[PDB]
Amino acid sequence: SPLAAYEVDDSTGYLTSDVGGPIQDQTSLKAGIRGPTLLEDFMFRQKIQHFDHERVPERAVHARGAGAHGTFTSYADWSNITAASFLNATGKQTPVFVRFSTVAGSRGSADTARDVHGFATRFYTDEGNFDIVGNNIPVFFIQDAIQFPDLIHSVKPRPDNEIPQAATAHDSAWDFFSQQPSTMHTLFWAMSGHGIPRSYRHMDGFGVHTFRFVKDDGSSKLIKWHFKSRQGKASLVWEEAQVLSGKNADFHRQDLWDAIESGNGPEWDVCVQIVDESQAQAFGFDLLDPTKIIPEEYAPLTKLGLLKLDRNPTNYFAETEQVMFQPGHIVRGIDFTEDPLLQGRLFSYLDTQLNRNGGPNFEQLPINMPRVPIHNNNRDGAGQMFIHRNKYPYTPNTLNSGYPRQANQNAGRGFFTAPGRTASGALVREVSPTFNDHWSQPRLFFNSLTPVEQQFLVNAMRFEISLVKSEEVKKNVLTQLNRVSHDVAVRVAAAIGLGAPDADDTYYHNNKTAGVSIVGSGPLPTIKTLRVGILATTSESSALDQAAQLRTRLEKDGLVVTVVAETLREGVDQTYSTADATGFDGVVVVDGAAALFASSPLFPTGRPLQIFVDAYRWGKPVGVCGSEVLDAADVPEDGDGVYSEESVDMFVEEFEKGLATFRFTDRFALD
Amino acid sequence: SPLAAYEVDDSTGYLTSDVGGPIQDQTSLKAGIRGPTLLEDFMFRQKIQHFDHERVPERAVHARGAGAHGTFTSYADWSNITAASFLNATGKQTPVFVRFSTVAGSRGSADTARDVHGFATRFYTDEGNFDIVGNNIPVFFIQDAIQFPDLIHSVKPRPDNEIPQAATAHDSAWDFFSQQPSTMHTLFWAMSGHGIPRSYRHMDGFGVHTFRFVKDDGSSKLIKWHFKSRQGKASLVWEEAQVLSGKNADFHRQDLWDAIESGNGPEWDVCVQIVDESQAQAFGFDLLDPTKIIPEEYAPLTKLGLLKLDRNPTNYFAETEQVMFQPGHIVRGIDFTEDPLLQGRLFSYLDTQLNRNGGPNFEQLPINMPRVPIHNNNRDGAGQMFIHRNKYPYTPNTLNSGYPRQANQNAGRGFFTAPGRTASGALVREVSPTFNDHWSQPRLFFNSLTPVEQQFLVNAMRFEISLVKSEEVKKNVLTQLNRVSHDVAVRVAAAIGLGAPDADDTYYHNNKTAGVSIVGSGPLPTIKTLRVGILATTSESSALDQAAQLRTRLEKDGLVVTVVAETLREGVDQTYSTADATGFDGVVVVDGAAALFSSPLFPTGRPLQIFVDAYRWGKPVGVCGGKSSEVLDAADVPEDGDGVYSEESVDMFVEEFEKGLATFRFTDRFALDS
Amino acid sequence: SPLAAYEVDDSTGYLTSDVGGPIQDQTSLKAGIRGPTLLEDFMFRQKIQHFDHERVPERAVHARGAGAHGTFTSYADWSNITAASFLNATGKQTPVFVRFSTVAGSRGSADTARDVHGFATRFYTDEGNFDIVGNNIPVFFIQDAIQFPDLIHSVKPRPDNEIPQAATAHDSAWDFFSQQPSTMHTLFWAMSGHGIPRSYRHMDGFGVHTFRFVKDDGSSKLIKWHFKSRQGKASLVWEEAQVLSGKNADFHRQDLWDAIESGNGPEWDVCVQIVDESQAQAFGFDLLDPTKIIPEEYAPLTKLGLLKLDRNPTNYFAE
Ligand code: HDD
Ligand code: HDD
Ligand code: HDD
Ligand SMILES: [Ca+2]
Ligand SMILES: [Ca+2]
Ligand SMILES: [Ca+2]
Ligand SMILES: [Ca+2]
């Protein structure tokens, strides 16, 4: 609503300065028609001064990302567990804005880098903005906020030459990971398919920390936030992600923009695990430790409500670039815990917005404003957009009749710290011994992945570690991996020409936990928005008709279809020159196009076949509708995810199950 | 109230964060009742971070000032001289905002420093914001904008110790003045009563530069802007200005605030001198030279309209502190000239707002916004408040149908440079020799003051120059003063124990010009708002009765009356302890209070000092009731003196006293050099 | 010293840009001798751009103030009470910088306003800079830092018109004082001659808070800092202070400058009251409470060393 009031419409009218003076902006004022530009040319200077100052500092982490507006809807009256107003009645709706991001890359880096991903959600509640600033991975690399610049320095580019962009595959990152074993758990998630999701819509979100739900009576329970994707979970394969980074650095923000514009806004169930305060140490680790998950076997998910994203921003800079989240944006009914990672974040997010906004009044920007009245004695500051009528902004006062009133547990629905919280003991800079098991849970995670998924994780480590120059770093890395799993360390060492150290079984175990596998999570629940490329030709009229037939049948089921040919015309969306297998979730070749697969100035040598072969190699559903093609491609007609029909309607029925299966993992070799 | 849309009301409600979460802000969150404060206390950090960041850089000059909202009303359709939309119809009304200031002092320096004063006016017109950023003195110290930092560094405090505050009475300033003879004219104005005005309401405003009026057909005329005060002109005397600087640093801002709140908003006639392009060098000087005035005998003032300030800001910081004036905020119908001082100002004011605002979107602050729609392709930048719909912000485009459209002389009422302007010649860093006479106009100015005004100007120079430690600088100063006037140089040299150099008559003359004298402008046209202190006593109930009677009769003529006694009670506004003569424009003692003329309630001799100070500073003083000799004798004031009043009758006392307030100052109480 | 190495001498030489190119700065470049100024005039823009950006925000409190360099010399090896390295040997010298100030006025307000005064001392020790950021009055108005903007909004000028400058003599200040009774102790000090000292050299400095001295073995004691003036204590009277504010707004800064230039640099004995941890509530109040002094009858002063100011800054802004 502050969003609509600040929109500026330029669809009609004459150019004006920022002070409303009609002007021109196409030629400089000069002393004669071939003469020097004049200093008194105010039109030139105001325009270029604005241009000169357009940029602001990128976020220190999560610089690369994209956002959308939507709604959250409560499923029930949750007063039984929290006083939180946005959860206080069935069907209660609250507007949201969400930004998704990577962690390490600068603002112009590729979406499909391997990375932890941000999932930050703002709920504009009727008792204040509430932000959950989370990630797609439920556990974090480090156990104390003070270590965050060490982690980030080590993973960001080496500071002499600023290489490599958006990547952990260099010595410093692996030096840090091997010297700081708290990193293992998040490292294993990021080395799995969770590090390369198929889209922002196909990943989950997690608050990571344990928080508290607090009731109006003051009793509390411990919670973890989980946002569970209704689109299902899906990942790229690494070799595909690399090419995609080059062919389309905007892949995830494009995918989100497109799904929203087509009426397919993504959805999540907002859930919690809820446990009692006495269970803080009951599960075999400390709930204050952000490197641990609570297995679903010990605490099931309760569904609180529905999160839907359904409207794109109007201006990226003003909304997505300027949104300033804070876990300190908290509301009555929620409280913090003593997680030393969370505790330090509270300081950092308030402070960093001064850097980004260059002034203290960043909560006045339309995107950061609340949707309820503000009453407080904050004043002045650069960029002050309010005119305060209260000329006695201090408490206690009589000159403004004692207003604003103090709000607390008793009065004014004030935020209040959970009143059962205590502290005791020496003031110390010590890590709790309860945080010391860094290896059991990564092993639990690894155990819970399918064999193919385990192989992809080993191969991600083989790829990254083989790029580490230092032989000593590589050995130290093997030492740590070996504490999680000997087999992992053996298979990793094989690719780098070192021997693994002997098995150390202190942390080894065979336990599994549900719901962490991507491959294991069954077929996608929906195929809407998935992309089908139809490889066709203009040389045969039958090819284009076959292409058009297929189009209409696939588009009916909500698939985004691209017909590719040598050159554009009616019915053809893309040329072979601009097409690539990274652009599709499945690829169909219409038999009429068989000749392209066996040279043209219109596209690089071998392109049409390369698209089909890359798609197959990357595990995608592929087919021919009309077997010369299958033999050009070395693609066996009996393979799972390979479709060959002369019949259109049988082709499509089968192909669509392939899209749901999404990837055909039998095409990847195991150790 | 023109800015009502941005106001925030806190007359009810619970405290919230800036994101609307209700909170408390009186006690920190601690680990135990006598424990350490916690980092998770976001209530504490949000409030303190806001406080830690409240201040913004002061303006590089004119840092000390005060402002008010108003209205400008046009007296005519001025289409026949200018296309300016705000001047296009009789009675047309445009909101304004004005800020007045000193030049040299920091924030918190005293209003009544001796200085050039700013008088900056924003007209929020229906064709964009138009600013006239003027001073109370019509000529400037320097002839080229590039010399501004030199001037300002020399006047501002010495950079090793930052002494002295808000004063040109130090070596560096007079070193600059004496080495840069262009300074002489403004220097003479600042050493006159114009350097110490009685209030912002009692000074004029001037644009200083020659500008152009431009008609829709492209023809232009040369103009000077004059804002002529309807309250009259009035000054302090130096010795009063110094005491006032201590007793009430906020004298001028309080005076303006009070006049507006009492329904006595000050007024100016906004006027121009208008001359042809052909007259640029016709008056014996260059109209491009900002050190020169056009004598009113050569070009009379034309009244364009009325400026009235009638509404005080709601929040000083948000309005007065954040207002960002620019002579680059120009509208169709006005243009610049090649005055080299003006020319560089165009650059400085756009640049310096980046320092003040800390980001490029300073035109979006409520006080800076225009009152018409904005359509342009400026985007992003820190602090961006707009959400722009047009996703094609480039020209030329087809994807936004070629909008926004280019505005110019022939379409969309665009600004346009006066089309008869030309340049010719080498690209030079040279001063035009037409700028070289630095001395004739300061002499013209000096000749146009009354004998007592001339004395006051000489005495201001004696005061400041006697504080210059360098004997070499004092000598250089006398050299320049001597080129304006031998008599000035001799009279100033007398105080500083140097001989003046031999007369040099190159620039001496005896011409005079109307309208530059303050003493010579006759009685004030109005005495509304002037301050009368009535010195009484609580010892005698009849003194209080007399004070009450006098109050009723003075208030019915719109004077602001303060009754002073030993202690407060009904009928008494101020105690003697807080009272001072700098607080009044006239002083009356009620004869019941004669005995006061020791107590633990006020400093010794305070009641008499107020009366003696007021008399010595030239103010109307008197005793009401009939018994006047004890007070006048104690004070050493002659009963028959001009501006000295004694009557038994309250009615007759007030009639006479009110003539004295309009006379304002009694100049026969000041000695003149022979 | 970082200061000496960053000094810039301009007693000879030709004018240069900030990147070392010789230039002139007295006339703008124009198209013709009576023509418009050219955008290509980089000499003009670099000079004006610097001028346009010379100011920085004043301090949110204590904006009006003045400073000097000097030395601190320890009287003893204080290892028996603190591990602090600048106090570890008789005669050990540490460079200092001190800035004195008022609290409420903006940076061009008068020195002789009635107010609490700042006395902030930096010791550039051989184990890091150590700052004691104190006032000339030993107790503070409020008991919790979260109330500081309330105190400060109330004493600073009313926000609609920004009146009155540098004074507590207005409704909002007295409203706060009368609603928030913790203010009474400092109020009494500020209303006494401690609010209008004769000079920065004629006042004491106090750390105000209780701090701790920690020995290398880890034991600790509670301390209050006191800087006791060797010039004696002296104050103005109010009628005089008011006139002085107008006649010389720079009175204290001039006084300090002159005393140093004449070889009369001011001195303070740096002292502590030192008490056991067990005595935090022994004296009839809580030593965590910054509105309370420890009467010297209950804990005497120990003199640690001599603070002397003896060198004025070279550039006021930079230092
Ligand atoms: C103490 C330092 C620190 C620590 C330990 C963390 N962060 Fe953080 N985070 C920041 C300091 C920070 C920051 C420097 O303050 C950022 C950069 C820009 C911003 O607004 O805050 C930020 C940005 C940021 C963003 C992007 C928000 C947006 O899209 O604008 C997300 C999603 C996260 N963080 C999430 C996390 C999670 C899930 C963490 C561990 C559980 C975490 N951060 C630990
Ligand atoms: C080239 C530099 C330069 C030159 C030659 C001038 N000025 Fe200026 N002026 C500034 C640079 C500047 C500035 C640094 O840009 C200021 C300080 C803050 C601001 O907004 O602009 C300013 C402020 C300022 C103000 C205060 C506006 C306000 O209340 O906010 C007034 C009244 C003037 N000036 C008036 C003048 C007059 C009448 C001049 C000679 C005719 C003059 N200036 C020459
Ligand atoms: C929570 C806010 C807060 C509180 C409770 C205090 N101050 Fe403070 N003080 C500031 C916040 C502040 C500040 C806003 O952070 C300043 C302004 C500029 C700066 O460097 O710090 C400051 C400046 C400042 C200066 C000027 C230092 C200099 O000359 O540059 C002195 C002497 C003091 N303070 C002394 C005190 C004393 C003796 C206090 C009570 C025992 C005190 N302050 C409480
Ligand atoms: Ca490296
Ligand atoms: Ca900045
Ligand atoms: Ca000097
Ligand atoms: Ca007040």
CSV table of C-alpha atoms in Angstrom, one decimal, chain B residues 402-622:
chain,number,residue,atom,x,y,z
B,402,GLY,CA,8.5,8.2,-27.1
B,403,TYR,CA,7.5,9.5,-23.6
B,404,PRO,CA,8.5,11.6,-21.8
B,405,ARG,CA,8.4,14.2,-24.6
B,406,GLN,CA,11.3,16.7,-25.0
B,407,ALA,CA,10.1,20.2,-23.9
B,408,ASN,CA,11.6,23.4,-25.4
B,409,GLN,CA,10.8,26.9,-26.5
B,410,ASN,CA,8.1,25.6,-29.0
B,411,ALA,CA,6.7,22.5,-27.2
B,412,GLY,CA,5.6,21.6,-23.7
B,413,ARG,CA,6.5,25.1,-22.2
B,414,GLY,CA,10.1,24.0,-21.9
B,415,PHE,CA,12.8,26.2,-20.3
B,416,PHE,CA,14.9,27.7,-23.0
B,417,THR,CA,18.1,29.8,-23.0
B,418,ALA,CA,17.4,33.4,-24.2
B,419,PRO,CA,18.0,32.9,-27.9
B,420,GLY,CA,19.8,36.3,-28.4
B,421,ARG,CA,22.7,35.2,-26.2
B,422,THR,CA,26.1,34.7,-28.0
B,423,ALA,CA,29.7,34.2,-27.0
B,424,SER,CA,32.8,35.2,-29.0
B,425,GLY,CA,36.6,35.3,-28.5
B,426,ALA,CA,39.4,33.2,-27.1
B,427,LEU,CA,38.9,30.7,-24.3
B,428,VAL,CA,40.5,32.7,-21.5
B,429,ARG,CA,41.1,32.7,-17.8
B,430,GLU,CA,41.1,36.5,-17.7
B,431,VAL,CA,39.2,39.2,-15.7
B,432,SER,CA,37.4,41.7,-18.0
B,433,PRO,CA,39.0,45.2,-17.4
B,434,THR,CA,35.4,46.5,-17.3
B,435,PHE,CA,35.4,45.1,-13.7
B,436,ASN,CA,38.4,47.1,-12.5
B,437,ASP,CA,36.9,50.0,-10.6
B,438,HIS,CA,36.7,48.7,-7.0
B,439,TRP,CA,36.4,52.0,-5.2
B,440,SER,CA,33.8,54.5,-6.7
B,441,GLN,CA,30.8,52.5,-5.6
B,442,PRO,CA,31.9,52.0,-2.0
B,443,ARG,CA,32.4,55.8,-2.0
B,444,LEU,CA,28.9,56.3,-3.5
B,445,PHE,CA,27.6,54.2,-0.7
B,446,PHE,CA,29.5,56.0,2.0
B,447,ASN,CA,28.3,59.4,0.7
B,448,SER,CA,24.7,58.2,0.8
B,449,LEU,CA,24.7,57.6,4.6
B,450,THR,CA,23.8,60.3,7.3
B,451,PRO,CA,26.6,61.7,9.4
B,452,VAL,CA,25.7,59.4,12.3
B,453,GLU,CA,25.6,56.3,10.0
B,454,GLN,CA,29.0,57.3,8.7
B,455,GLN,CA,30.2,57.4,12.3
B,456,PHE,CA,28.8,54.0,13.0
B,457,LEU,CA,30.5,52.6,9.9
B,458,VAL,CA,33.9,54.2,10.9
B,459,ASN,CA,33.5,52.8,14.4
B,460,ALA,CA,32.8,49.3,13.1
B,461,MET,CA,36.0,49.5,11.1
B,462,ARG,CA,37.9,50.9,14.1
B,463,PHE,CA,36.6,48.0,16.3
B,464,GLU,CA,37.6,45.2,13.9
B,465,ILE,CA,40.9,46.7,12.6
B,466,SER,CA,42.1,47.4,16.1
B,467,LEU,CA,41.9,43.6,16.7
B,468,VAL,CA,44.2,42.7,13.7
B,469,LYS,CA,47.6,41.8,15.2
B,470,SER,CA,49.6,42.3,12.0
B,471,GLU,CA,50.9,45.9,11.6
B,472,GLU,CA,51.5,45.1,7.9
B,473,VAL,CA,47.9,44.0,7.3
B,474,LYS,CA,46.6,47.2,9.1
B,475,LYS,CA,48.7,49.3,6.8
B,476,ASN,CA,47.4,47.5,3.7
B,477,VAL,CA,43.9,48.0,5.0
B,478,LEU,CA,44.4,51.8,5.3
B,479,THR,CA,45.8,51.8,1.7
B,480,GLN,CA,42.5,50.4,0.3
B,481,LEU,CA,40.2,52.4,2.6
B,482,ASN,CA,42.2,55.5,1.5
B,483,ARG,CA,41.3,54.9,-2.2
B,484,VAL,CA,37.6,55.0,-1.3
B,485,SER,CA,37.9,57.9,1.1
B,486,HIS,CA,40.7,59.8,2.7
B,487,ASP,CA,38.5,60.9,5.6
B,488,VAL,CA,37.6,57.2,6.3
B,489,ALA,CA,41.2,56.3,6.3
B,490,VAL,CA,42.2,59.1,8.6
B,491,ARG,CA,39.4,58.5,11.0
B,492,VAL,CA,40.0,54.7,11.1
B,493,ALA,CA,43.8,55.2,11.4
B,494,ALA,CA,43.3,57.4,14.5
B,495,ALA,CA,42.0,54.4,16.6
B,496,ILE,CA,44.8,52.0,15.6
B,497,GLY,CA,47.8,54.4,16.0
B,498,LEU,CA,49.0,54.7,12.4
B,499,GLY,CA,49.0,57.6,10.1
B,500,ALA,CA,46.8,57.3,7.0
B,501,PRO,CA,48.7,57.5,3.7
B,502,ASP,CA,48.4,60.6,1.5
B,503,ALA,CA,45.1,61.2,-0.3
B,504,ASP,CA,44.7,59.5,-3.7
B,505,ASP,CA,41.8,61.1,-5.4
B,506,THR,CA,41.4,58.9,-8.5
B,507,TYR,CA,38.1,57.5,-7.3
B,508,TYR,CA,36.9,60.2,-5.0
B,509,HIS,CA,33.5,61.8,-5.8
B,510,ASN,CA,30.6,63.4,-4.3
B,511,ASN,CA,27.6,61.5,-5.9
B,512,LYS,CA,24.9,60.0,-3.7
B,513,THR,CA,22.0,57.5,-4.3
B,514,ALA,CA,18.6,57.1,-2.7
B,515,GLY,CA,17.5,54.3,-0.5
B,516,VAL,CA,20.7,52.8,0.9
B,517,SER,CA,20.6,54.7,4.3
B,518,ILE,CA,18.8,53.1,7.2
B,519,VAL,CA,18.7,56.2,9.5
B,520,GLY,CA,17.6,58.2,6.4
B,521,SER,CA,14.5,56.2,5.7
B,522,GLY,CA,12.4,58.3,8.2
B,523,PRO,CA,10.3,56.7,11.0
B,524,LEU,CA,9.3,53.0,10.8
B,525,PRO,CA,6.0,52.6,8.9
B,526,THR,CA,4.6,50.4,11.7
B,527,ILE,CA,5.4,49.7,15.3
B,528,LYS,CA,3.4,46.5,15.5
B,529,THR,CA,5.6,43.8,17.2
B,530,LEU,CA,8.0,46.2,18.8
B,531,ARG,CA,8.8,45.3,22.4
B,532,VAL,CA,8.2,47.5,25.4
B,533,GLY,CA,9.6,46.6,28.8
B,534,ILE,CA,7.7,48.0,31.8
B,535,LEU,CA,9.9,48.1,34.8
B,536,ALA,CA,7.7,47.7,38.0
B,537,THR,CA,7.9,46.3,41.5
B,538,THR,CA,5.9,43.9,43.7
B,539,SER,CA,6.6,46.1,46.8
B,540,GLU,CA,3.8,48.5,45.8
B,541,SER,CA,0.4,47.4,44.5
B,542,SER,CA,0.0,50.7,42.8
B,543,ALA,CA,3.2,50.1,40.6
B,544,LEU,CA,1.5,46.9,39.4
B,545,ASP,CA,-1.7,48.7,38.8
B,546,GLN,CA,0.2,51.3,36.8
B,547,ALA,CA,1.9,48.6,34.8
B,548,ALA,CA,-1.5,46.9,34.0
B,549,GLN,CA,-2.9,50.2,32.7
B,550,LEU,CA,0.1,50.9,30.6
B,551,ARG,CA,-0.1,47.2,29.2
B,552,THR,CA,-3.7,47.6,28.1
B,553,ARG,CA,-3.0,50.8,26.2
B,554,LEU,CA,0.2,49.6,24.5
B,555,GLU,CA,-1.2,46.2,23.6
B,556,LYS,CA,-4.2,47.8,21.8
B,557,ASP,CA,-1.6,49.2,19.3
B,558,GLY,CA,0.0,45.8,18.8
B,559,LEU,CA,3.1,46.3,20.9
B,560,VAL,CA,4.6,43.3,22.7
B,561,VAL,CA,4.7,44.3,26.4
B,562,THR,CA,6.7,42.6,29.1
B,563,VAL,CA,6.1,43.7,32.7
B,564,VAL,CA,9.3,43.1,34.8
B,565,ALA,CA,9.3,42.8,38.6
B,566,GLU,CA,11.4,41.2,41.3
B,567,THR,CA,9.4,37.9,41.2
B,568,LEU,CA,6.7,36.5,39.0
B,569,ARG,CA,3.0,36.7,39.8
B,570,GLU,CA,-0.2,37.6,37.9
B,571,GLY,CA,0.5,40.6,35.6
B,572,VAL,CA,4.3,40.1,35.6
B,573,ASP,CA,6.0,38.4,32.6
B,574,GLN,CA,9.7,38.5,33.6
B,575,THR,CA,11.9,38.8,36.6
B,576,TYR,CA,14.7,41.4,36.8
B,577,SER,CA,17.1,38.5,36.9
B,578,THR,CA,16.2,37.4,33.3
B,579,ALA,CA,15.5,40.9,32.0
B,580,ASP,CA,17.9,42.9,29.9
B,581,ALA,CA,17.6,46.0,27.7
B,582,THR,CA,18.5,44.0,24.6
B,583,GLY,CA,15.1,42.5,25.2
B,584,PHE,CA,13.2,45.7,24.5
B,585,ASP,CA,12.8,48.4,21.8
B,586,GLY,CA,11.7,50.9,24.5
B,587,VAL,CA,11.8,50.9,28.3
B,588,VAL,CA,9.2,52.5,30.6
B,589,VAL,CA,9.5,52.7,34.4
B,590,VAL,CA,6.3,53.1,36.5
B,591,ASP,CA,6.9,55.9,39.1
B,592,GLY,CA,5.7,53.6,41.9
B,593,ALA,CA,8.9,51.5,41.3
B,594,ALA,CA,11.3,54.4,41.8
B,595,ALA,CA,13.0,52.9,44.9
B,596,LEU,CA,14.5,50.0,42.9
B,597,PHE,CA,16.5,52.6,41.1
B,598,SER,CA,20.2,45.5,46.5
B,599,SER,CA,18.2,42.2,46.5
B,600,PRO,CA,19.1,38.5,46.5
B,601,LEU,CA,16.6,38.1,43.6
B,602,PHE,CA,18.6,39.9,40.9
B,603,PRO,CA,22.1,41.2,40.3
B,604,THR,CA,23.0,44.5,41.9
B,605,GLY,CA,21.9,47.6,39.9
B,606,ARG,CA,20.0,45.5,37.4
B,607,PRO,CA,16.7,47.6,37.2
B,608,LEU,CA,18.8,50.8,36.6
B,609,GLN,CA,21.2,49.1,34.2
B,610,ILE,CA,18.3,48.1,32.0
B,611,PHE,CA,17.2,51.7,31.9
B,612,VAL,CA,20.7,53.2,31.3
B,613,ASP,CA,21.6,50.6,28.7
B,614,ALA,CA,18.3,51.3,26.8
B,615,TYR,CA,19.0,55.1,26.9
B,616,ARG,CA,22.6,54.7,25.8
B,617,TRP,CA,21.6,52.5,22.9
B,618,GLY,CA,19.3,55.2,21.6
B,619,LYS,CA,15.9,53.7,22.5
B,620,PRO,CA,12.9,55.7,23.6
B,621,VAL,CA,12.8,55.6,27.4
B,622,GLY,CA,10.6,57.2,30.1
